[PDB]
Amino acid sequence: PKDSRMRLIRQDVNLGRAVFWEIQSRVPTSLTSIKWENAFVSVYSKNN
Amino acid sequence: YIGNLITRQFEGRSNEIVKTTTKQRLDAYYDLELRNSVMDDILEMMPESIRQKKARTILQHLSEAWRCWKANIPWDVPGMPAPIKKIIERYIKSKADAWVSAAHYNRERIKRGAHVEKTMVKKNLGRLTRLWIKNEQERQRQIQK
Amino acid sequence: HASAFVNKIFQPEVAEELIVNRYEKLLSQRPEWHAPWKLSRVINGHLGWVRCVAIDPVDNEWFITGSNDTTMKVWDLATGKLKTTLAGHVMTVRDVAVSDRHPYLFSVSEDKTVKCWDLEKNQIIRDYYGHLSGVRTVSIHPTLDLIATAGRDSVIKLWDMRTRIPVITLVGHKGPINQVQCTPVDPQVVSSSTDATVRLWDVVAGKTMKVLTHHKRSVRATALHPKEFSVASACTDDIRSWGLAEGSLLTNFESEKTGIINTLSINQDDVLFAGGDNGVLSFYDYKSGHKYQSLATREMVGSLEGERSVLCSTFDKTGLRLITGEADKSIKIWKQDETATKESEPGLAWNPNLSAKRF
Amino acid sequence: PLPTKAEIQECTARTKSYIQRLVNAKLANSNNRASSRYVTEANLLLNNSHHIEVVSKQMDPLLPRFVGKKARKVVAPTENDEVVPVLHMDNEWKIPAAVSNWKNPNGYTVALERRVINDGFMKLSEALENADKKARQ
Amino acid sequence: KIRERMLEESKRIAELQKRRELKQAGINVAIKKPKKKYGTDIDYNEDIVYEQAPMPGIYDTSTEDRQIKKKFEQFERKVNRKGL
Amino acid sequence: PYGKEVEVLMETKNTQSPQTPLVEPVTERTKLQ
Amino acid sequence: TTSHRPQLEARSGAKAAAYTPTGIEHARLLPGHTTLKYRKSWRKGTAFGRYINDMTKSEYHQEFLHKHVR
RNA sequence: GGAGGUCAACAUCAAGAACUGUGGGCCUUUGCCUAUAGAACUUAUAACGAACAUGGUUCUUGCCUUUUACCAGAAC
């Protein structure tokens, strides 16, 4: 449910999308294709 | 109902019965009208009179070119005139576009959960295996290029 | 002058009979000027060939076109935008016709059917039954609530529009019919089959008024002229113009070395379009026969070479705008290029050829 | 010229009358009793002179009407004496015979002869060999 | 179909053999016809079945008609007497 | 691909609603009912 | 074999015109619509860290086929 | 003349809350305004029927070997 799943607060959205940015940048595209459409990030913090 | 039954009793059956195009006879009617459409455009290119025995031997390249399209074999005929090869290549690209679109539509109806026959799911698996291996061969070719 | 020199010495029994007279007259005859055309916008959005197009005969705001993905589409004329879509055939739509007396869209298709769409609710009202194979042609009668359809059946059916009864069947040809035009006075139905004839039908009697046998191959396209009461019939390179109510040969168009001519159209001020199977679209004067522009349709990005051919065309109601649909599954609009004058863009300079003996 | 506004009217009226006669006959021969609410509405002289009165008869509603009607197959004699003339004017196109590798309908035995790099590769393998020698050093 | 054509051929030969024997005996059994498989199946010696007349022209064909009719009647009589 | 003047536009959606008619009905008498 | 023909003609509509009809009433010819209308740091350890008109060669077919083949 | 009919024919029955006729004026007949005579039956928690069935076409579903025969909502 909506109470249950990750609650989209600006700091945590920016944090998770930033961590995926870094992990995507660590691997070349010619080796594998890591995309944001296939990923799932989940932040535990004081707002989640 | 009984009016039609009793008039069939006294008066036979109407000989003038035509057949509605249904799901049963659609993949046949597409063939009939495709080949009429091809043979008109090829009969107009000729400067001679074809006299009509040649026409049914001309359409064998249409059948062979479609078989070569499905199998991803390139279909070069060695002594073929140029605009006739252009006509056949045009109509085979037409038939293949309708073929690919129908494969996509029926796979979406298979995913969603719509009612579908057993033969239609076998036909759709056979279509999609062609489409996958054609994408695979073109990926190998573009890598080598 | 020179024809006096020929006539006093050679002495033809009829001065019109001799060929130097009929060639000297054409050189002295001097056709009219028309403006050159250009491409204006290109509209994508079908999933197969654009087989047929029709225009609103009243308001001139939208044009409908049927296609090879078995759907018809109503496009905005002025902006080019897609208003709506219509499905209801299972095989391709061969010809569309919008009525001018009632809000009816009669569509015809290759799956042997003829349908009547309401444009007030966008649904199918009336289905028609009786064609042994797939119909390729709809005209609508100008004053009598009829439909005339034809296909590979080798007959013309003249449907009543209320009771949907195949009232009158015209049995004349020896092949599929490519075009049927309706006409308000006694050559009331003018058809053209693939046995190189064009027939003028008496629909009350049931027989033919006159068979026109001048073409050598299948007649694929015809057109009625809006202000003239004459017809134009195209062939594999043979465009002629015919008078109705007599059946004369009024003029032959210099149309040589253009390939299979798929479509025709006639503007109000005597322009004749003739798009061909080789992607060449050529514009003629109507009263003369002079071809004053030829163009070639550049097809698309990843298209083929065979995939450029104008399969259908029409003109705007005001007439200054040409709508073609090519075999590269695209819709192209052509424009009169208002800037050019008689001195800037002259034409092709009118040199009729005594050789080919056709002029 | 275009045809005048009077001939359009005469032609429209005469042909409208004809189409309505055909539609009334087709709806009046039907077995549906409901069709006769959609229709929209004799003496003849048999010789020099005889003055007969053609009356119709009232038929039984249960016995079949049009007792001659039946479904038959007919050929028609196509008869004309209008000869009409066909008024015309005055190696590259040889298509080869078709041999297919899938179908052979008459089962013939056709002649057996008839039926049937980029630099990135090198640069990659060069760099891998250099990497091998570098790692060993 | 190959087999059925050969068998119908030999069946016709036997059917003519018995007639020739009875003709020698002096009793002339006429040849029975094949039966019709449907009600309007067409026999092809009764009539010229879809006879199209050649639409006469300007020239005159009375004596050539008489000459053909003479020749055909004489051929039929010769096949009757002598037998082709 | 056709130069500056000739515009191309890909079209896959219906701008008008599918219910909104093409030929609009004529209402003779204003009905307050 | 020899039952498999490419149709090379069509049934002429004139061929069934001299027939005499029958008069069975069909379910799709009942009266219907009788009316006509009318118009009017930690990030440093990594070695790498810093429409074509053919349907099969499109991106829609490739996203379809990359979805359905796993 | 009067009562009655499990008698017939022909009009009429769903619409600016809504009918027809007549006179006068304006436009050029249709239509608009104005003065007048009549309107049976049906209708406002809306319709002749304090009752209530089936058929066609196109959408959306349900049973799922295919078509009839079907499941049950919508529009015409």
XYZ file of C-alpha atoms in Angstrom, chain G residues 33-68:
36
model
C -32.746 2.359 -40.383
C -35.695 3.061 -42.645
C -35.194 6.833 -42.466
C -32.630 8.850 -44.403
C -31.023 11.953 -42.942
C -30.202 15.053 -44.984
C -27.649 17.821 -44.876
C -28.967 21.391 -44.778
C 37.136 9.034 -0.727
C 35.200 5.902 -1.596
C 34.237 6.726 -5.184
C 37.818 6.408 -6.382
C 38.653 2.701 -6.208
C 36.720 1.749 -9.340
C 38.625 1.232 -12.599
C 35.824 2.777 -14.698
C 34.464 5.466 -12.375
C 34.618 8.967 -13.877
C 10.708 6.464 -37.791
C 12.723 4.625 -40.443
C 9.665 3.312 -42.436
C 10.586 -0.375 -41.938
C 8.754 -2.103 -39.126
C 11.272 -4.808 -38.243
C 14.102 -2.264 -38.116
C 12.204 0.097 -35.799
C 12.505 0.532 -32.049
C 8.951 -0.598 -31.260
C 9.599 -4.072 -32.689
C 12.921 -4.247 -30.853
C 11.402 -3.282 -27.496
C 8.581 -5.799 -28.076
C 11.007 -8.553 -28.969
C 13.453 -7.699 -26.177
C 10.520 -7.944 -23.784
C 9.054 -11.227 -24.959
